[PDB]
Design an enzyme around this catalytic site. Structure first.
Site, PDB file in Angstrom:
ATOM      1  N   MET A  55       0.821  -1.208   0.000  1.00 28.15           N
ATOM      2  CA  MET A  55       0.000   0.000   0.000  1.00 28.15           C
ATOM      3  C   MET A  55       0.856   1.259   0.000  1.00 28.15           C
ATOM      4  SD  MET A  55      -3.059   0.973   2.600  1.00 28.15           S
ATOM      5  CE  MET A  55      -4.187  -0.113   1.727  1.00 28.15           C
ATOM      6  N   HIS A  60      -2.641  -9.381   6.070  1.00 26.96           N
ATOM      7  CA  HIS A  60      -2.911  -7.990   5.718  1.00 26.96           C
ATOM      8  C   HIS A  60      -2.207  -7.746   4.389  1.00 26.96           C
ATOM      9  CE1 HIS A  60      -3.170  -7.865  10.264  1.00 26.96           C
ATOM     10  NE2 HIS A  60      -4.378  -7.482   9.891  1.00 26.96           N
ATOM     11  N   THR A  61      -2.888  -8.102   3.297  1.00 24.01           N
ATOM     12  CA  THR A  61      -2.190  -8.295   2.033  1.00 24.01           C
ATOM     13  C   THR A  61      -1.611  -6.990   1.512  1.00 24.01           C
ATOM     14  OG1 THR A  61      -4.140  -7.942   0.642  1.00 24.01           O
ATOM     15  CG2 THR A  61      -3.780 -10.163   1.512  1.00 24.01           C
ATOM     16  N   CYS A  62      -2.188  -5.854   1.909  1.00 25.35           N
ATOM     17  CA  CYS A  62      -1.678  -4.566   1.466  1.00 25.35           C
ATOM     18  C   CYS A  62      -0.327  -4.249   2.091  1.00 25.35           C
ATOM     19  CB  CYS A  62      -2.687  -3.468   1.797  1.00 25.35           C
ATOM     20  SG  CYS A  62      -2.802  -3.053   3.554  1.00 25.35           S
ATOM     21  N   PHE A  63      -0.013  -4.863   3.231  1.00 22.57           N
ATOM     22  CA  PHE A  63       1.321  -4.831   3.811  1.00 22.57           C
ATOM     23  C   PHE A  63       2.089  -6.116   3.536  1.00 22.57           C
ATOM     24  CE2 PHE A  63      -1.402  -2.384   6.884  1.00 22.57           C
ATOM     25  CZ  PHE A  63      -1.016  -1.137   6.439  1.00 22.57           C
TER      26      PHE A  63
END
Lengths: 127, 402
Positions: free
Chosen positions: A80, A102-105
């Site tokens: 992100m 937390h795929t965005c991290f």
């Protein structure tokens, strides 16, 4: 006829199973509260090496949100807030809850599971 | 080149052959034509080395030496004739001046003993059994063309002396006393372990020569598998010979597959291969002898080359173990050679299934091994804009796969 696949498996049907160089991930892994020589990390890598190509791909989807392998390698893994490496954090909550992503991290939160078998079972149920 | 240096060195000779072409093969054919008419061990070394030279005018002398009381020399001649038969058609194209005397001596070695039904299966003759659990007819000679000598074990006279006495005491049919001599030296052998084992090995080699070029029967495959499954671990030589014989036989294939068990991950041959591989990879596990491992991989290659065998090697998942070999094996010449054999086997399998290879990330493993060998050459020859032969053969087979 398509409804037999999962939301992971439909991606794997359209775009195919990637080949995951677990050695490239290990070379591009960041440990935050674990250490590169923590015992839970050696158990993690043993489990992830033991998973087949489909469970590896499902893991990659679980933590990055995609099966796409970066051409330059996982060093170029985007998040992100710019290029974010994959990352494993120790989940200091109770160890009777699944790992969480937390795929965005590109972030895995992993409880300190007491054994290889339990950690592997919970991870396989997650993916 | 270094072949010429080895020739000049050889031309203490027996000490050098113990350490280990025209005029060296001619001196060898000399001593062959001399010894068969501090001698026997020179013949044995000449043979043991010649069985390497052919592997990178002797036929007559070799058949003349296949008629000897001492089994060591018979075994050496047989091993030389196995090398010839397996890798080139030198004795198949030959004329019947000596091809038939040879193949008949080989037949008289190979011919059955009665298998399991009668009590003379191959597996039993490798375990000791105390010499009292075999049929009482093992030390009984019954030549009929009518000689019925009994208890040749009790008689201590040299086997050749007994044969000579039979020759004088009776008029033996001309040009077929060989079947008597082979029966008598067998009946002397079976009394004791080393000689029984040597006769078993000689019969197995004779089969294999007779098939690379009436002997085979329904029980033979089972008997050979049983020889393999013996747990003594002191019979690796016999097991290797049995595997080589099975490889010949493949050249009944559905029965070989049904017995060895290659159709299932759990099965004697698959498990054996996986154990050999793990012992080769891990130092802790005692490495299976080089000859035995060579025979196993040769059998696998010779099977994969047939669709039924390649489908069985699919079914048992040998691609995973062979990719394990090609990933974790070391750099030494023998390990390089096993990696080459594994790559060839993988190529033969992938000629009919890809999914296992792809699922095991095989392409990555192949590329990494190619990088590892080119990086090991990079030390000798770092220039970028001679190779060790085994590594060049590895690179060659792996680029052919790619």
């Amino acid at each position: 006829l398509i409804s037999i696949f999962t939301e992971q498996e439909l991606e794997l049907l359209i775009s195919g199973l990637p080949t995951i160089d677990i050695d490239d991930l290990k070379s591009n892994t960041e440990y935050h509260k674990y250490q590169s020589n923590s015992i839970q990390i050696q158990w993690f890598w043993r489990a992830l090496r033991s998973f087949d190509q489909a469970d590896r791909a499902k893991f990659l989807q679980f933590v990055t949100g995609t099966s796409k392998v970066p051409l330059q390698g996982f060093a170029a893994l985007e998040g992100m807030n710019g290029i974010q490496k994959f990352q494993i954090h120790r989940d200091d909550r109770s160890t009777d809850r699944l790992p969480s992503a937390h795929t965005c991290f590109n972030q895995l939160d992993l409880p300190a599971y007491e054994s290889f078998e339990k950690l592997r079972h919970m991870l396989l149920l997650a993916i | 080149a270094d072949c010429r240096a080895l020739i000049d060195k050889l031309k203490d000779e027996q000490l050098l052959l113990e350490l280990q072409w025209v005029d060296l093969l001619d001196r060898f054919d000399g001593i062959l034509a001399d010894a068969g008419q501090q001698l026997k061990m020179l013949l044995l070394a000449v043979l043991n080395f010649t069985a390497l030279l052919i592997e990178y005018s002797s036929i007559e002398h070799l058949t003349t030496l296949l008629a000897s009381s001492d089994m060591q020399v018979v075994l050496a001649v047989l091993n030389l004739l196995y090398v010839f038969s397996k890798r080139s058609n030198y004795i198949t194209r030959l004329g019947s001046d000596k091809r038939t005397p040879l193949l008949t001596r080989l037949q008289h070695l190979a011919e059955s003993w009665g298998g399991k039904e009668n009590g003379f299966g191959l597996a039993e003759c490798c375990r000791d059994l105390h010499m009292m659990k075999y049929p009482p007819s093992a030390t009984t000679l019954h030549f009929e063309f009518y000689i019925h000598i009994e208890q040749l074990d009790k008689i201590s006279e040299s086997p050749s002396e007994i044969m000579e006495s039979l020759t004088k005491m009776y008029s033996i049919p001309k040009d077929k006393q060989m079947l008597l001599f082979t029966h008598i030296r067998l009946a002397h052998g079976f009394s004791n372990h080393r000689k029984r084992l040597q006769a078993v090995q000689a019969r197995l080699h004779a089969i294999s020569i007779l098939v690379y070029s009436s002997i085979l029967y329904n029980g033979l495959i089972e008997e050979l598998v049983d020889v393999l499954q013996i747990t003594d671990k002191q019979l690796m030589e016999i097991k290797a010979a049995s595997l080589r014989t099975l490889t010949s036989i493949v050249h009944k294939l559905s029965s070989i597959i049904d017995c060895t068990g290659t159709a299932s991950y759990h099965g004697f041959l698959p498990v054996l291969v996986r154990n050999c591989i793990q012992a080769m990879i891990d130092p802790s596990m005692d490495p299976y002898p080089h000859q035995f491992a060579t025979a196993l991989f040769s059998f696998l290659y010779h099977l994969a080359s047939y669709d039924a065998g390649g489908e069985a090697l699919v079914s048992c998942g040998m691609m995973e173990a062979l990719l394990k070999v090609i990933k974790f094996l070391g750099d030494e010449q023998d390990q390089i050679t096993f990696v080459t054999r594994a790559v060839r086997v993988v190529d033969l399998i992938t000629n009919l299934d890809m999914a296992a290879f792809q699922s095991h990330s095989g392409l990555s493993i192949f590329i990494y091994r190619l990088e590892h060998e080119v990086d090991l050459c990079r030390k000798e020859c770092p220039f970028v804009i001679q190779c060790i032969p085994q590594r060049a053969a590895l690179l060659k087979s792996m680029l052919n796969f790619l």
